[PDB]
Amino acid sequence: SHENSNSATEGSTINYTTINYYKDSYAATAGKQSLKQDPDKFANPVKDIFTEMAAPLK
Amino acid sequence: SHENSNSATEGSTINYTTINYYKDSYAATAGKQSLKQDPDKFANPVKDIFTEMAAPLK
Amino acid sequence: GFPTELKPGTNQFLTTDDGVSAPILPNFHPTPCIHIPGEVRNLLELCQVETILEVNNVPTNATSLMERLRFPVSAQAGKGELCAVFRADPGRDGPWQSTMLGQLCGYYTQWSGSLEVTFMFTGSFMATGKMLIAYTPPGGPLPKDRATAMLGTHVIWDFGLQSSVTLVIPWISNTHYRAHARDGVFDYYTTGLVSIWYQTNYVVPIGAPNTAYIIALAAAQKNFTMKLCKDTSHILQTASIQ
Amino acid sequence: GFPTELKPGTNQFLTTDDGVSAPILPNFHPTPCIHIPGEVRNLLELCQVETILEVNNVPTNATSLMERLRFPVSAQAGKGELCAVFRADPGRDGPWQSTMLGQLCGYYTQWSGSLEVTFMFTGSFMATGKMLIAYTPPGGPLPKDRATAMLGTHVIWDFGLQSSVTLVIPWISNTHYRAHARDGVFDYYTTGLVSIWYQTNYVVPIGAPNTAYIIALAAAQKNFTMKLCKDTSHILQTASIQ
Amino acid sequence: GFPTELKPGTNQFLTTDDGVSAPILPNFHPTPCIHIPGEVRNLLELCQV
Amino acid sequence: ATAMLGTHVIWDFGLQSSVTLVIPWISNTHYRAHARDGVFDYYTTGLV
Amino acid sequence: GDRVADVIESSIGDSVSRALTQALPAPTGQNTQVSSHRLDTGEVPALQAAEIGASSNTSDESMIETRCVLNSHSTAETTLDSFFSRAGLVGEIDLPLEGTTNPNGYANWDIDITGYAQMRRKVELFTYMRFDAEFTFVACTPTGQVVPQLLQYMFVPPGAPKPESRESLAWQTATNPSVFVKLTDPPAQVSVPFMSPASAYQWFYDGYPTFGEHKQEKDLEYGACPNNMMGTFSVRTVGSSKSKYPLVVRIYMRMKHVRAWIPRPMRNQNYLFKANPNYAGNSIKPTGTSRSAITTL
Amino acid sequence: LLQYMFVPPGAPKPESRESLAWQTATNPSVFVKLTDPPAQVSVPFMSPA
Amino acid sequence: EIGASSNTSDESMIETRCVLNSHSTAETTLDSFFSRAGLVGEIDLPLEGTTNPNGYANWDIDITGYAQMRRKVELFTYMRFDAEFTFVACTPTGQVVPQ
Amino acid sequence: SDRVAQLTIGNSTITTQEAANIIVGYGEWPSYCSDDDATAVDKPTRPDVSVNRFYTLDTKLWEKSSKGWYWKFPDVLTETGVFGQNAQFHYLYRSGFCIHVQCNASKFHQGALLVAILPEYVIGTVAGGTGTEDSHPPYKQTQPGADGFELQHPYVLDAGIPISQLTVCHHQRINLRTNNCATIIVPYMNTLPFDSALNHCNFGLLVVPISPLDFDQGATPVIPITITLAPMCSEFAGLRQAVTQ
Ligand SMILES: CCCCCCCCCCCCC/C=C/[C@H](O)[C@H](N)CO
Ligand SMILES: CCCCCCCCCCCCC/C=C/[C@H](O)[C@H](N)CO
């Protein structure tokens, strides 16, 4: 399908599989997102990472 | 697609990618124009072209 | 004229139907995206942050609404007394309603995986003590003594240099997913109780104050999973906005 | 009978929907095209031509409407005086409204890139002078002295053999695109000011006239870009044509 | 605008028509199945008792 | 709030009980002499 | 080139975002390993410090005696596209016959999704969003009846002259996108791209858009972000004379290709105004519910 | 014109016709008239068991 | 006085920074400017009157009858285009009748 | 090896022996904008060591009946130093931050604090008590300056959002049993690469006492809280005259 590439995702690490019947890519369906998580961003945002086997403050 | 070639573009340097469901090519969609500009036609229409590093009238 | 045939489901408007729709702006390239920090890619990333659990939801008036975050401990007669108790349902009207897990599992019908409740002691440095934090699987009512509540899953917690313990509530369930429990027939999805008993006492020397406080912080594990997105239950709205 | 299902968006008429429609004339070959000079392929080609900027939009009556293209200079007391000032918004009611950039960015909502304002001196040959043409990024109000207005982006312009200078207005912006500014909340998209101060004076010998004139010509750069095509704002129409 | 033509049998509701219908819950994975004994695969298995 | 703008060191009390404010050699000359009242205030080092 | 040593060995101009995290693929939940009894010294996985700010990293195996479970619960439901792609009511436009609200057969609606409390509470979970849309306009009489009436929707971008009346010359839509529908058909459905000058929308913008001495008259411009004022939605009964059917238009927006940044707490109080986080001063209601004591249920 | 609404177990039921639970921000709803073919959805296996 | 415009780059006037510009110019082309349907004519068919009382009306083909479409197409002198006409018929009160 | 730390940046140094850890905001360090994200065409100035240094703002008084305070950033640094004189002359502005809140007590005092970073903390008022008037906060409450502002209803954070979910953003706790300082490194969080530094405040710092203070008669009765913060990777673009607001 030869179309324009101007959706609100372009330039990301997530690869879609959508259907589209027009020339512009913001009219396409939502599709199947890739399942990539990152718990280390909001839950463990510390500089030195400590092991769970050790007490942190010694 | 075997059809007639009688659109209002034929014989140009712009190559389209359109869809069409009839035998004549003026009923097709607008499509994706090629992006070719020419600023030297309306902005610098002079015979001898001068460099921007040099004053023109010396 | 291609042969076709309209089957039912025609001229309906399903609010959740994913399909191609008609774009209004042709050959339109949007504003390019820049690197903004804090990009979520899932809503299981907001489950694993600890938030304050309103265990002491006794006070009502607006001048003392800040007191509903911590519960007091003090010196007892040394009989193994009871400090606080609360249910472990994150889809019920109670202490779990004011977390990031109680508002993001208000938008879902079923949930799975292990909860965890991280406590924190905010007393003096020269004051120590031990607490028994027992978790009761369902069927068992409110225990009348610490000797009865010891039989469940419990964790003995000593105060000292480190001032936080983590009682992970295990996923003791017959079903793969459980829904939100409430009164009536929906007591089948009850998770249990969490009770806090004085193990020994709260010992304090001369000069340090009598009453200390504990702050409870609840989170989720790495095997937490939600399903069947719904509308939120524990909120209302007055009529005639503006 | 092929199985199908009509989804919503059916039996609508979108004015911008690109699609195949039914042709009325079969096997029709049109008139062949010949080489006509002046073929545009973009509307960014009409942005880069200079057009007269109505800086002196003081007069009103029809007998003096030709005076709104140039602004006068003369001999001062030599105190660093002010000649003219105007805003640098090409989507506002002002001097930029009568350019090729003010009518082709009336048909768009947002614009980007650098502007440039090319002046031209139409005085005598034996008369020289110097002007300071300062550009003020937004936030800064109208300056009260040339010592205050020197702190922005400015260009000192001497008169002589060459009689045109080009103050390119840099794209100093926080956003990638900016919209058309007007009064109220939309002052957030303001571009700034351009002021013209007497650097030294306007010196003239015996026999040559006192008052000269400067013509301002505005254009666009090679990084100009517009977006979000709209209806034009700075025009009206009376009712009952014919 | 693709050329088409509605043939009869249109806007009917046949109770036994097998066809694709519109799903209401997107990206929904159901509860996984476990080994429950006594799985029928035909109704000729209840004839022979 | 005025004295914070120079070179400063915030010092907490605890187990270790000594901090070291090294005064940097902020000077226009290679060597400086001994300052006193009058014209010889040119060789002043500053304040702590 | 460079000859000084405090620049050639410096770090001025570090442009790349030095990230401490690295996103790993996680299609299902995490399994559980077999753990036995452990009675050792020094190695404690149950004692942490909440003063650090990070959360608990206690596995289930390091606290109880576990069993091996091959977990196969999919996490494809809690993603952003499977949470926001559900169309909710964002606005309602009235067109009565004899009244004072809109008695001239047209009504202008400014584009904001913060008019109804059920959609507003979901999108204000985050601070920055970046989405497309699929609008849907369901038109009916106030008694639900469908009448044979023709209607014109018009999207007015910010700047274009609004129509003063029904017979005005701005309705000729030479460049504005317009939708012509009747009422005896399926409802209209368009697709709106990401139309912002910024790189993302923002529902909370702390600050003023103008400069100058902010006094008591100019205080209402606080929090009005002009990267979100997307224009004006306009409707009319397509004709010259007075119509005879009352109309009600309802707007349903669903987001697709959603990216969200910087989460924040969700609101617990009642909403009071549009684009204004005011609340009731006397009626501060707590989040949970109250009981008699803490020792009993 | 009619609106069907699927209320999952837990969500607040509408008290009346003008109630603010009909705004269906996350509930799947079907909007049909009566002058069309009847609505048809596809419900998955929605059980915890 | 030469007649050509300014060729002054931004780098030759101020001290610039390296910017990898990625703003697309696919919006200002001719197909993305004129492919928006505007009202070019209106035909009246009344019952009792003097304009068209015989149930028919003849309209000469010209797109210069309404001021909003006319100002766009008169930006150029010569044009060469196809068209997609669209005829929306209704009562003067907007009602749709079986006619 | 973990209790003690030192922060050296510019010509300033903070040494503390009862620290917990140095949190990093969203796993991203502050940096300079790349050529892809950049919008302007003028070269941005960047003073290296003259603005990336600690500014000790003000001393608060944590009494028994305290409620909380909030400081809007970067409003607090428009009158202090070369940073306060560059943000008055320049138009565009881009910087991370590094916030460090000291609060000390003995081993006989008890209490806790919540140090939070809330991006785009929009102040809302009480709408006249009953919720009828469309009131708006004044200029002396929205941008308070370097002196902060006392919270009137800290349970709803004076913005409608509850306090119990505040820890989804950046939070460290000053618990007077184990630690005495809370250090947060915040990157640049905005939808635009640059921003004006006179109207838009990026994030708001919130210091609220969760667990109250307590002591017996004989200890010293005043416990001060001091905020100390340092911009990091500051950049400015676009010169004009000095305007104050
Ligand atoms: C016929 C055209 C249909 C109208 C299409 C409108 C497109 C506008 C884009 C909608 C995206 C939501 C806009 C969000 C802004 C919020 O209201 C503000 N941040 C708060 O007032
Ligand atoms: C059922 C057939 C529908 C009618 C189709 C009409 C085809 C005519 C082609 C339209 C192209 C525009 C004609 C432009 C001419 C301008 O009015 C004149 N130059 C000025 O009067």
mmCIF file of N, CA and C in Angstrom, chain D residues 78-160:
data_model
loop_
_atom_site.group_PDB
_atom_site.id
_atom_site.type_symbol
_atom_site.label_atom_id
_atom_site.label_comp_id
_atom_site.label_asym_id
_atom_site.label_seq_id
_atom_site.Cartn_x
_atom_site.Cartn_y
_atom_site.Cartn_z
ATOM 1 N N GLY D 78 19.229 64.837 16.437
ATOM 2 C CA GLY D 78 20.362 63.984 16.727
ATOM 3 C C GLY D 78 20.342 63.422 18.132
ATOM 4 N N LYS D 79 19.203 62.865 18.541
ATOM 5 C CA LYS D 79 19.074 62.258 19.855
ATOM 6 C C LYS D 79 18.773 60.768 19.802
ATOM 7 N N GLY D 80 18.922 60.129 18.644
ATOM 8 C CA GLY D 80 18.571 58.731 18.497
ATOM 9 C C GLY D 80 17.073 58.524 18.537
ATOM 10 N N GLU D 81 16.359 59.134 17.595
ATOM 11 C CA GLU D 81 14.908 59.161 17.629
ATOM 12 C C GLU D 81 14.324 57.900 17.001
ATOM 13 N N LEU D 82 12.997 57.811 17.025
ATOM 14 C CA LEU D 82 12.262 56.672 16.500
ATOM 15 C C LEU D 82 11.573 57.058 15.200
ATOM 16 N N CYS D 83 11.661 56.177 14.204
ATOM 17 C CA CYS D 83 11.058 56.420 12.897
ATOM 18 C C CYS D 83 9.718 55.709 12.743
ATOM 19 N N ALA D 84 9.699 54.390 12.922
ATOM 20 C CA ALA D 84 8.496 53.599 12.702
ATOM 21 C C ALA D 84 8.607 52.302 13.482
ATOM 22 N N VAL D 85 7.451 51.738 13.824
ATOM 23 C CA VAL D 85 7.391 50.449 14.495
ATOM 24 C C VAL D 85 6.164 49.692 13.999
ATOM 25 N N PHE D 86 6.283 48.366 13.947
ATOM 26 C CA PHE D 86 5.194 47.501 13.521
ATOM 27 C C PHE D 86 5.426 46.108 14.082
ATOM 28 N N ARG D 87 4.344 45.349 14.223
ATOM 29 C CA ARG D 87 4.455 43.987 14.716
ATOM 30 C C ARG D 87 4.923 43.052 13.607
ATOM 31 N N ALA D 88 5.457 41.903 14.010
ATOM 32 C CA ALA D 88 5.982 40.924 13.071
ATOM 33 C C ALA D 88 5.089 39.696 12.940
ATOM 34 N N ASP D 89 3.776 39.859 13.093
ATOM 35 C CA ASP D 89 2.848 38.746 12.947
ATOM 36 C C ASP D 89 2.258 38.750 11.545
ATOM 37 N N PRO D 90 2.510 37.732 10.721
ATOM 38 C CA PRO D 90 1.882 37.671 9.397
ATOM 39 C C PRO D 90 0.471 37.106 9.395
ATOM 40 N N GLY D 91 -0.168 36.967 10.551
ATOM 41 C CA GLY D 91 -1.549 36.536 10.597
ATOM 42 C C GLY D 91 -2.396 37.479 11.425
ATOM 43 N N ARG D 92 -2.004 38.748 11.458
ATOM 44 C CA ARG D 92 -2.684 39.752 12.256
ATOM 45 C C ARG D 92 -3.083 40.903 11.347
ATOM 46 N N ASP D 93 -4.107 41.637 11.768
ATOM 47 C CA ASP D 93 -4.543 42.832 11.055
ATOM 48 C C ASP D 93 -3.522 43.950 11.252
ATOM 49 N N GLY D 94 -2.702 44.187 10.236
ATOM 50 C CA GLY D 94 -1.672 45.191 10.322
ATOM 51 C C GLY D 94 -0.934 45.387 9.015
ATOM 52 N N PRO D 95 0.374 45.646 9.108
ATOM 53 C CA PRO D 95 1.163 45.873 7.893
ATOM 54 C C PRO D 95 1.334 44.636 7.035
ATOM 55 N N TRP D 96 1.322 43.444 7.624
ATOM 56 C CA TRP D 96 1.564 42.238 6.843
ATOM 57 C C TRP D 96 0.349 41.784 6.053
ATOM 58 N N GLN D 97 -0.801 42.432 6.225
ATOM 59 C CA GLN D 97 -2.041 42.026 5.580
ATOM 60 C C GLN D 97 -2.037 42.232 4.073
ATOM 61 N N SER D 98 -1.169 43.092 3.548
ATOM 62 C CA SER D 98 -1.193 43.397 2.125
ATOM 63 C C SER D 98 0.035 42.859 1.409
ATOM 64 N N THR D 99 0.509 41.688 1.815
ATOM 65 C CA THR D 99 1.614 41.043 1.125
ATOM 66 C C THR D 99 1.102 39.795 0.423
ATOM 67 N N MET D 100 1.985 39.059 -0.248
ATOM 68 C CA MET D 100 1.647 37.734 -0.749
ATOM 69 C C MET D 100 1.770 36.687 0.344
ATOM 70 N N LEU D 101 2.480 37.014 1.419
ATOM 71 C CA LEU D 101 2.557 36.168 2.593
ATOM 72 C C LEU D 101 1.427 36.406 3.573
ATOM 73 N N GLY D 102 0.791 37.569 3.543
ATOM 74 C CA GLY D 102 -0.331 37.809 4.418
ATOM 75 C C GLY D 102 -1.655 37.336 3.892
ATOM 76 N N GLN D 103 -1.747 37.062 2.592
ATOM 77 C CA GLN D 103 -2.952 36.493 2.014
ATOM 78 C C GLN D 103 -2.864 34.994 1.796
ATOM 79 N N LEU D 104 -1.659 34.442 1.688
ATOM 80 C CA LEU D 104 -1.475 33.002 1.580
ATOM 81 C C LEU D 104 -1.251 32.333 2.924
ATOM 82 N N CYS D 105 -1.109 33.101 3.995
ATOM 83 C CA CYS D 105 -1.104 32.569 5.348
ATOM 84 C C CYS D 105 -2.354 33.052 6.068
ATOM 85 N N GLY D 106 -3.319 33.525 5.293
ATOM 86 C CA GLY D 106 -4.655 33.740 5.802
ATOM 87 C C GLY D 106 -5.477 32.503 5.526
ATOM 88 N N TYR D 107 -5.018 31.713 4.562
ATOM 89 C CA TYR D 107 -5.625 30.437 4.229
ATOM 90 C C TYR D 107 -4.978 29.273 4.961
ATOM 91 N N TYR D 108 -4.200 29.537 6.001
ATOM 92 C CA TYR D 108 -3.599 28.492 6.810
ATOM 93 C C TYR D 108 -3.648 28.910 8.271
ATOM 94 N N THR D 109 -3.642 27.920 9.158
ATOM 95 C CA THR D 109 -3.768 28.180 10.585
ATOM 96 C C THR D 109 -2.424 28.389 11.266
ATOM 97 N N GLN D 110 -1.434 27.567 10.943
ATOM 98 C CA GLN D 110 -0.133 27.617 11.585
ATOM 99 C C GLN D 110 0.945 27.836 10.539
ATOM 100 N N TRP D 111 2.047 28.456 10.950
ATOM 101 C CA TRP D 111 3.173 28.686 10.064
ATOM 102 C C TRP D 111 4.469 28.503 10.833
ATOM 103 N N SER D 112 5.553 28.309 10.089
ATOM 104 C CA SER D 112 6.867 28.099 10.674
ATOM 105 C C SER D 112 7.914 28.744 9.784
ATOM 106 N N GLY D 113 9.128 28.849 10.299
ATOM 107 C CA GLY D 113 10.254 29.333 9.529
ATOM 108 C C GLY D 113 10.514 30.808 9.759
ATOM 109 N N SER D 114 11.567 31.288 9.104
ATOM 110 C CA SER D 114 12.048 32.648 9.287
ATOM 111 C C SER D 114 11.410 33.596 8.284
ATOM 112 N N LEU D 115 10.983 34.757 8.769
ATOM 113 C CA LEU D 115 10.575 35.850 7.904
ATOM 114 C C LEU D 115 11.794 36.691 7.544
ATOM 115 N N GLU D 116 11.634 37.579 6.567
ATOM 116 C CA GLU D 116 12.657 38.578 6.296
ATOM 117 C C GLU D 116 11.992 39.813 5.715
ATOM 118 N N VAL D 117 12.523 40.973 6.083
ATOM 119 C CA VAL D 117 11.968 42.259 5.691
ATOM 120 C C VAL D 117 13.062 43.043 4.988
ATOM 121 N N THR D 118 12.922 43.216 3.679
ATOM 122 C CA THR D 118 13.911 43.907 2.866
ATOM 123 C C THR D 118 13.466 45.348 2.675
ATOM 124 N N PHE D 119 14.278 46.289 3.129
ATOM 125 C CA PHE D 119 13.961 47.699 2.976
ATOM 126 C C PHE D 119 14.599 48.241 1.706
ATOM 127 N N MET D 120 14.221 49.463 1.348
ATOM 128 C CA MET D 120 14.793 50.122 0.183
ATOM 129 C C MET D 120 14.702 51.624 0.380
ATOM 130 N N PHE D 121 15.796 52.325 0.108
ATOM 131 C CA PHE D 121 15.876 53.767 0.281
ATOM 132 C C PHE D 121 15.636 54.451 -1.055
ATOM 133 N N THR D 122 14.699 55.399 -1.078
ATOM 134 C CA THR D 122 14.362 56.107 -2.307
ATOM 135 C C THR D 122 14.652 57.594 -2.173
ATOM 136 N N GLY D 123 15.821 57.940 -1.639
ATOM 137 C CA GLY D 123 16.229 59.319 -1.501
ATOM 138 C C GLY D 123 17.214 59.738 -2.576
ATOM 139 N N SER D 124 17.841 60.888 -2.341
ATOM 140 C CA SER D 124 18.820 61.429 -3.268
ATOM 141 C C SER D 124 20.103 60.603 -3.236
ATOM 142 N N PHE D 125 20.978 60.862 -4.205
ATOM 143 C CA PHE D 125 22.272 60.196 -4.205
ATOM 144 C C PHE D 125 23.265 60.856 -3.263
ATOM 145 N N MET D 126 23.181 62.173 -3.085
ATOM 146 C CA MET D 126 24.116 62.911 -2.252
ATOM 147 C C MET D 126 23.712 62.915 -0.784
ATOM 148 N N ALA D 127 22.617 62.248 -0.439
ATOM 149 C CA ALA D 127 22.140 62.172 0.931
ATOM 150 C C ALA D 127 22.414 60.789 1.500
ATOM 151 N N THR D 128 23.124 60.751 2.626
ATOM 152 C CA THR D 128 23.432 59.505 3.308
ATOM 153 C C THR D 128 22.755 59.489 4.670
ATOM 154 N N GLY D 129 23.023 58.430 5.416
ATOM 155 C CA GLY D 129 22.412 58.251 6.716
ATOM 156 C C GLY D 129 22.550 56.815 7.152
ATOM 157 N N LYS D 130 22.296 56.596 8.437
ATOM 158 C CA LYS D 130 22.351 55.258 8.997
ATOM 159 C C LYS D 130 21.122 55.024 9.855
ATOM 160 N N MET D 131 20.589 53.808 9.780
ATOM 161 C CA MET D 131 19.400 53.432 10.530
ATOM 162 C C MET D 131 19.685 52.160 11.310
ATOM 163 N N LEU D 132 19.086 52.069 12.492
ATOM 164 C CA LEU D 132 19.143 50.869 13.313
ATOM 165 C C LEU D 132 17.787 50.190 13.255
ATOM 166 N N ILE D 133 17.768 48.946 12.792
ATOM 167 C CA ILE D 133 16.530 48.210 12.572
ATOM 168 C C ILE D 133 16.534 47.051 13.560
ATOM 169 N N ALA D 134 15.896 47.246 14.710
ATOM 170 C CA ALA D 134 15.958 46.308 15.819
ATOM 171 C C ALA D 134 14.711 45.437 15.880
ATOM 172 N N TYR D 135 14.927 44.151 16.139
ATOM 173 C CA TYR D 135 13.861 43.175 16.294
ATOM 174 C C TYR D 135 13.822 42.715 17.741
ATOM 175 N N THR D 136 12.646 42.797 18.353
ATOM 176 C CA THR D 136 12.482 42.474 19.763
ATOM 177 C C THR D 136 11.704 41.175 19.911
ATOM 178 N N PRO D 137 12.301 40.130 20.480
ATOM 179 C CA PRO D 137 11.550 38.920 20.843
ATOM 180 C C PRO D 137 10.478 39.231 21.875
ATOM 181 N N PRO D 138 9.418 38.419 21.961
ATOM 182 C CA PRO D 138 8.231 38.824 22.726
ATOM 183 C C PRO D 138 8.468 38.881 24.226
ATOM 184 N N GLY D 139 7.559 39.576 24.900
ATOM 185 C CA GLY D 139 7.698 39.848 26.313
ATOM 186 C C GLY D 139 8.144 41.274 26.538
ATOM 187 N N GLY D 140 9.061 41.740 25.697
ATOM 188 C CA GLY D 140 9.546 43.094 25.775
ATOM 189 C C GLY D 140 8.602 44.072 25.109
ATOM 190 N N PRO D 141 8.173 45.094 25.852
ATOM 191 C CA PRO D 141 7.253 46.090 25.286
ATOM 192 C C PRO D 141 7.942 47.074 24.353
ATOM 193 N N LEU D 142 7.213 48.102 23.937
ATOM 194 C CA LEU D 142 7.774 49.166 23.109
ATOM 195 C C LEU D 142 8.876 49.901 23.859
ATOM 196 N N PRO D 143 10.105 49.922 23.352
ATOM 197 C CA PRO D 143 11.191 50.577 24.081
ATOM 198 C C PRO D 143 11.061 52.090 24.029
ATOM 199 N N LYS D 144 11.580 52.721 25.075
ATOM 200 C CA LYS D 144 11.522 54.163 25.229
ATOM 201 C C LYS D 144 12.762 54.877 24.715
ATOM 202 N N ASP D 145 13.819 54.148 24.371
ATOM 203 C CA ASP D 145 15.061 54.752 23.916
ATOM 204 C C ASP D 145 15.785 53.734 23.046
ATOM 205 N N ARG D 146 16.669 54.237 22.178
ATOM 206 C CA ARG D 146 17.494 53.374 21.340
ATOM 207 C C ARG D 146 18.482 52.550 22.154
ATOM 208 N N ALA D 147 18.869 53.025 23.339
ATOM 209 C CA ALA D 147 19.743 52.259 24.219
ATOM 210 C C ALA D 147 19.046 51.036 24.798
ATOM 211 N N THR D 148 17.714 51.049 24.861
ATOM 212 C CA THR D 148 16.983 49.886 25.348
ATOM 213 C C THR D 148 16.712 48.905 24.212
ATOM 214 N N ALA D 149 16.449 49.424 23.011
ATOM 215 C CA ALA D 149 16.102 48.586 21.868
ATOM 216 C C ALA D 149 17.310 47.944 21.202
ATOM 217 N N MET D 150 18.530 48.325 21.586
ATOM 218 C CA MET D 150 19.724 47.741 20.988
ATOM 219 C C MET D 150 19.971 46.310 21.442
ATOM 220 N N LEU D 151 19.301 45.858 22.506
ATOM 221 C CA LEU D 151 19.637 44.582 23.120
ATOM 222 C C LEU D 151 19.068 43.392 22.368
ATOM 223 N N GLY D 152 18.102 43.600 21.479
ATOM 224 C CA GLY D 152 17.566 42.505 20.697
ATOM 225 C C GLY D 152 18.425 42.168 19.499
ATOM 226 N N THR D 153 17.822 41.578 18.475
ATOM 227 C CA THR D 153 18.503 41.359 17.209
ATOM 228 C C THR D 153 18.352 42.611 16.360
ATOM 229 N N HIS D 154 19.474 43.207 15.972
ATOM 230 C CA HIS D 154 19.422 44.458 15.234
ATOM 231 C C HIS D 154 20.462 44.446 14.128
ATOM 232 N N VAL D 155 20.230 45.290 13.128
ATOM 233 C CA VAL D 155 21.098 45.421 11.965
ATOM 234 C C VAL D 155 21.277 46.905 11.682
ATOM 235 N N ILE D 156 22.524 47.361 11.642
ATOM 236 C CA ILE D 156 22.836 48.745 11.306
ATOM 237 C C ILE D 156 23.021 48.836 9.800
ATOM 238 N N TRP D 157 22.335 49.787 9.176
ATOM 239 C CA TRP D 157 22.238 49.871 7.725
ATOM 240 C C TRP D 157 22.713 51.241 7.267
ATOM 241 N N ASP D 158 23.738 51.258 6.420
ATOM 242 C CA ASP D 158 24.298 52.484 5.865
ATOM 243 C C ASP D 158 23.761 52.687 4.456
ATOM 244 N N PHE D 159 23.523 53.944 4.090
ATOM 245 C CA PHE D 159 23.105 54.258 2.731
ATOM 246 C C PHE D 159 24.327 54.522 1.861
ATOM 247 N N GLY D 160 24.225 54.170 0.584
ATOM 248 C CA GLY D 160 25.342 54.326 -0.326
ATOM 249 C C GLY D 160 25.031 53.869 -1.735
#
